[PDB]
Amino acid sequence: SAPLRILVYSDNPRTREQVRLALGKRIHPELPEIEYVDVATAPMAISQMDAGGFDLAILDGEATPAGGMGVAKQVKDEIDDCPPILVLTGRADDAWLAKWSRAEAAVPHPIDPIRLSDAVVSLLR
Amino acid sequence: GDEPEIIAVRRGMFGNRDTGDTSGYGRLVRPVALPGSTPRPYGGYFDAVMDRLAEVLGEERYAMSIERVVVYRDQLTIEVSRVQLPAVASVLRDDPDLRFELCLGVSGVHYPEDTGRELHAVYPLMSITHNRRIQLEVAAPDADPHIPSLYAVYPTTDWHERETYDFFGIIFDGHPSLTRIEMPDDWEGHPQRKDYPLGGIPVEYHGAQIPPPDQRRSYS
Amino acid sequence: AWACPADAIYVEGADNTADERYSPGERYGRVYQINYLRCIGCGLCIEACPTRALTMTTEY
Amino acid sequence: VEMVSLTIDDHEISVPKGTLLIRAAELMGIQIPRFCDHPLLDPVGACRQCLVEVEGQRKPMASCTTTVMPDMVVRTQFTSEAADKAQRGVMELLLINHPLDCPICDKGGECPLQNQAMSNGRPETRFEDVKRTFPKPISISSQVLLDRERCVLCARCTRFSSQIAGDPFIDLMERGALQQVGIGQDKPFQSYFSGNTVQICPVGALTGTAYRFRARPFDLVSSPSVCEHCASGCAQRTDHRRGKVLRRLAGDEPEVNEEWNCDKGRWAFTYATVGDRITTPMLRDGGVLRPASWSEALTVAAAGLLTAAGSTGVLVGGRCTVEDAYAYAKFARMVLNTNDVDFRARPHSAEEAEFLAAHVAGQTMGLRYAELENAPTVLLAGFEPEEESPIVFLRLRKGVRKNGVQVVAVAPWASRGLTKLAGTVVPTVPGDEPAALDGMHDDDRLRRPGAVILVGERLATSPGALSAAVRLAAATGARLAWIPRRAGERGAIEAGALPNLLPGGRPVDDADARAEVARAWYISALPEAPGRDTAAILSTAASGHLAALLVGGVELGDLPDPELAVAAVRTTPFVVSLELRESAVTELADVVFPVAPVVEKAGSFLNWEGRPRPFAPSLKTNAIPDLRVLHYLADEIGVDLALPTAEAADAELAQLGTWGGARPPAPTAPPTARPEAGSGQAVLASWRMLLDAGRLQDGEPHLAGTAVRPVARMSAATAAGIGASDGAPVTVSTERGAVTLPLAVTDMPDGVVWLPMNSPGSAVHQRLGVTAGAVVSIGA
Amino acid sequence: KLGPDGLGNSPEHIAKIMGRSMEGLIHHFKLVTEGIRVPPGQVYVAVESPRGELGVHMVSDGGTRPYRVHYRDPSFTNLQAVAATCEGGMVADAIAAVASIDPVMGGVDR
Amino acid sequence: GLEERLPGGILLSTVETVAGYVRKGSLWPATFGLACCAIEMMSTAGPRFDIARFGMERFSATPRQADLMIVAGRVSQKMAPVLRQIYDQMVEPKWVLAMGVCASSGGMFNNYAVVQGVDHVVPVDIYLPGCPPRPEMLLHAILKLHDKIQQMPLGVNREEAIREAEQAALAVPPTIELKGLLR
């Protein structure tokens, strides 16, 4: 199998750590191994997405210089055959914007490990 | 009716919304009543306005329509019973002695503790000809938040019935199209209802953050 | 901070121990942060201060 | 009840006879200013702030002291110029000497003096003279600072420390303007209820040293809560700032704790932030405990549990909420298909399990605090109300002072709590409790209607003691109530987290009960083999006959034989820990899952009266309860536990309801002969102090400093026979170790030595490996 | 008051509240922190804003915070005239009509 | 463009510096403004000040000609899609100036209706405090953006700068962990 590569985007290193903690090397033993590419800045995330080869992108809607929802909209408008996007929302009322970002799934802060894992499995399945 | 309208029951000294910081001060029970029915000799031209409204409306119709009359801070409010709102609005607009042609809008206010009357719609009416003004108040339960739309009588209430709907869910039955005007149509909930959370985020600081004011302690 | 409409001030008091005193009296504000991306310049803070410790300059 | 009509201002109402004018005004919605008045304290009429004008009285009457009388006419400051003038003059006199400390005062924003000076005070000062001054602040204990200048001498603190808590270590001192609340000398305040004086002070005079200068009300996030520690289940108000709990006020639950706490509940909230908290799932790799992802940890735990099939034990501990304990039981019986479930992480017995099934499980609200205050006679067996369930002590003291409750304790010696209850000791060496209980069948006091027998958890350690208590309750007719020490034990019982019990008091040994619970769980059938208790599970695992353990929130040091417990967990091939904190189990576990503390989790406790004590989370955090850890561990194992949240568990428990069928038989255990202590040896008595080396008390040095001095207590004859002297160090010893503490001659029955079970430097279970009732060598 | 350190509470007020007046200190503290308490009631008050009748429905529940504050902003009502003043004319006429309405959208949406 | 294929010698450095000088000047704002911050932006264009001195008087009516998007006011939920559409319909290189507290962090309006900072939806280059920022403050922020634009790399230098900025950003702790002197 091919290590599924997941892009974790957040200016906050602790959000990236939590995302990587919820999703281990294997979300389930039936699923392939997972390799994480951490990106703290929007330019790096966009360039990585352009390089392709990602199975999922987790974008923090609370990212300081460039929010995850904006990056999600940008990638789904700029990359052809871009992978499913999961957005982390800083509040419940952000749900509407999460829908606008066209992200395949939205997980509110604080990141529930189990909710995030279930959403990731659903997106990769 | 005829009793004071309690919109909230405040218990405990110092406006504590919960158990309270200092022991022994929480036993007070002070109902929060809005001003009640005014004694009949209303002030200024309010007496003339009400006499004319009771003359144009039949005694039976007047009693069925006007639920209450309040004169607070030299301002006249008429608690108009739901259902009867279009009739009294037509009478107020058309009656030459009343002639309240200018309706300034509709304002929604939510009283989650006012049983059977949680949602109030306020209609500020002004008569330029007589240089008078009044307010109508129409109450509706949270269970059946329906009010008769005044679109036929006061077209200006259009968008107001919408804003008030968008922010409270009052249905204003009969409105040509009661669609959200402020919030997106996909929006869930009615923001200005007291039960709708403020929806803020913590304010970020170095090493700390301040939750939104709705989460933090308050005294009223 | 109490009076700020925008929650733009964060303040944490601490004791003026004899070994290290920063202000007269029992308390001093050891942490004092203003989130100027939340400040609306209303000036309620300075009107709130009972010591004039907080002023607002003309620097912008 | 007699009812008297009355007129306050122009309005008229009727109130029960004996009501105070201030209370009538409160019920009517009139706000009379008050400082010294307190509903739960006997009126004192000191501050004179509550003056009102009463028709037929020349002087203004203190509404806080004037009982309502029929046809009385009262005019408050709202409708009487004289009353308003009196109240405002009293306020002015109250403020002349007050310090200009509002900005620096902790009570600022929450100060009754500020509010009542705004609403009933002059706009500006007339006082141009010199203010009275004191050195400020002065510590009256490790926890409480006193600012005598802000003190309005309302005496609420002293009146509380005398009436409510029998700990009058503060009193009003000096005279006149120099009068001040004080402790007299270096002797500290030293009561478990000191924090209440902080919450009862209407000014910033008494303040908590822990909460000092850490916040003002506006930035506090305040949430209703329930105390985690005792089985009292006090309603509380947890206040936290920037995600850190700063204080926990007493709340207002008239049916549970009224407006009081013990110091433990108020200040023992720092345990979750002392640095030992487990923040991520951990796995045993290379013999070291390494951080692991949730996915990897769950997968490893599921693999190990499946490889351990039926040979698994589940130690639930007493800290879990009712929902959490229900999840543990459901996981053990549905997922692990084993009945080896036990929440008792402490000295216990099979007779205890039988008694809990027979008389406790499935029977809620049988006795209530309101009944304790009215019970003509209360018999305490193996129970120290002040050390265990302090609010029970407060209610018993209230009953003693008001309704003349008579308290009897079958205990080796009169603890300070018992003395404060005016209770009479029945001096019994530990283990001889069944003899004393059987010897009270003829006690006329217990025949009296409403008589109550409160049994502590410790009677489980005495064979036949619980059976004797059940027999005594049956013969006398006195209602029997069992009062544990940990908040989650009664919830665990209702959760069915016992080897012989199922949820709702349903006995395991009843085919109908098993069928009903299985139908409610949508499962084929529940395990039928009898379950092993905590001691049996530990013995089996230590012998190597247990394949794995699921240990949730268990302090191995609290078990009667902690050496056995550590050996068991070490020898167990696979150990899964659901622990909030780094612990001994964690050091020896194969998989460790972090679980949210109480402040971060929704749930409900059951207090000793079986009352539900619900609470929503105060801190929103990514931490998850034991419920979800178990649910998703089962899901990885492949069984849908159907407990995604506390709401689901509560709904399932409500659907199951109480058993309501054939009640299990009473224990009826025989009174096994007590061991006889020879020369140089004594029978060990012990109970846990309120403030001791308990883990949840960690991180709070002031509270620990408030703990009672640990002392080994002996009868004078026994101390003389051991060559010791009062105050001199004495060492008690077993084959495992020794505990050395200063000696206190206590007039105990001869041949009995009492120790604090877990006070610092005592740790009786760890240091000696024995519990109350064992024989221990004594020496000077 | 102004001083070499900028704008802030006047030194005389500081002296009054922190030095001599306990009542003054209490009043400053409370009126700044919680603020006044407004007796419960409803009031509709209107002014002639540059764009028309700016009305305010203000409801107090007796607390230190406004229970309900609704602005009838004249721009909100005036924008209902866009259909009347724009339909039939050219887009160039629509621009002039809307500008004549002079809507400030902050008042419109609030 | 071919300017991004140039070798990293002195040629690329000079192209970078001249492009930065050219773009810092003639930095046409988009004809875009949400609330009172828009009024202060107009005042900055007004005679008392002169945005024109900086070559920025041409407020591009269409985003195609716009180079800088001064958000200049509060962004509501319903407006965020529109603002993002306007941003995407500008042609690179683009820059976003979050004028005012509302545009930068939501300001005083910390509630459901406001986005809590336009960086939630568009990359922000400069945050400008004020409510509203006085026109001098806007000019200060604009000059700061000019300084940023002048030092903007290109081509291989741009890629190296992106990598270095990523490496630096991955290490910075969050603001919630700067507990300096907090009790």
Ligand SMILES: CC(C)=CCC/C(C)=C\CC/C(C)=C/CC/C(C)=C\CC/C(C)=C/CC/C(C)=C/CC/C(C)=C/CC/C(C)=C/CC/C(C)=C/CC1=C(C)C(=O)c2ccccc2C1=O
């Ligand atoms: C190929 C090649 C390189 C050849 C070599 C030779 C060579 C280099 C080229 C040859 C020369 C060439 C072709 C050069 C290129 C440049 C060129 C051709 C031209 C471009 C330059 C040019 C056209 C200059 C003049 C343009 C000009 C007259 C500009 C002035 C425009 C003005 C007056 C702007 C001010 C507008 C303004 C006030 C802005 C505010 C906008 C706001 C506030 C928006 C939001 C907003 C609005 C709109 C409200 O009105 C409002 C009202 C009330 C409440 C709220 C609001 C609100 O929110």
Ligand SMILES: Nc1nc2c(ncn2[C@@H]2O[C@H](COP(=O)(O)OP(=O)(O)OP(=O)(O)O)[C@@H](O)[C@H]2O)c(=O)[nH]1
């Ligand atoms: N699984 C789980 N563990 C908890 C929970 N709360 C606390 N714990 C842990 O359980 C362990 C044992 O706690 P206790 O048995 O109460 O010991 P204690 O804290 O000294 O309190 P005592 O019962 O008086 O001994 C502690 O180390 C805590 O870290 C909980 O809600 N769930």
Ligand code: SF4
């Ligand atoms: S000017 Fe002062 S009081 Fe006003 S928002 Fe800014 S920091 Fe807060």
Ligand code: SF4
């Ligand atoms: S106790 Fe009350 S009045 Fe006295 S300084 Fe503190 S807040 Fe001010």
Ligand code: SF4
């Ligand atoms: S310390 Fe507080 S409670 Fe005690 S007398 Fe003084 S003001 Fe009253």
Ligand code: SF4
């Ligand atoms: S009595 Fe028990 S439950 Fe109540 S506050 Fe004290 S420790 Fe907590």
Ligand code: SF4
């Ligand atoms: S920051 Fe201030 S001036 Fe700018 S839009 Fe927001 S409220 Fe208006």
Ligand code: FES
């Ligand atoms: S409260 Fe009654 S005299 Fe003090």
